[PDB]
């Protein structure tokens, strides 16, 4: 279910933001991460409305 990544490969492929502890592609291309997190945040904000 859960395989540990090679830290070298993960760091080269993914930009890591320790301030928010987030992960993104270095090229900035949107993946399932961006979709899921953006959808969740949009639901949170629409609820805020």
């Amino acid at each position: 279910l859960i395989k540990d990544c090679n830290h070298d490969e993960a760091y080269l492929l993914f930009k890591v933001n320790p301030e928010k502890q987030s992960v993104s592609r270095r090229d900035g291309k949107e993946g399932v991460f961006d979709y899921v997190i953006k959808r969740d945040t949009d639901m949170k904000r629409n609820r805020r409305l």
Partner: protein, 92 residues
């Protein structure tokens, strides 16, 4: 719209300078069908090599910035060393 995410990201992070964007478009399909600046306005094709070597080097440096894997980084280091050795020696 049909360009891959690589060139899309490169163009988005690059400034809207027409020179750099036309270089990217030419790299994407060999040459750029740029619009002539003369009063006799017309479309003409310009090859990638017609763009200055420094801009291509900056493009590939940005590529290695967004893909910093060790083989790409070493290739950029070697090619930039060859740049500042051969082409810069030629420049003095």
């Amino acid at each position: 719209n049909s360009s891959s995410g690589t060139f899309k990201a490169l163009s988005a992070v690059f400034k809207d300078d027409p020179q750099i964007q036309r270089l990217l478009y030419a790299l994407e399909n060999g040459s750029v069908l740029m619009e002539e600046e003369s009063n006799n306005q017309r479309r003409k094709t310009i090859f990638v090599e017609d763009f200055p070597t420094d801009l291509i080097l900056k493009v590939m440096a940005e590529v290695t910035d967004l893909w910093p894997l060790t083989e790409f980084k070493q290739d950029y280091d070697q090619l930039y060393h060859n740049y500042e050795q051969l082409s810069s020696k030629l420049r003095f």
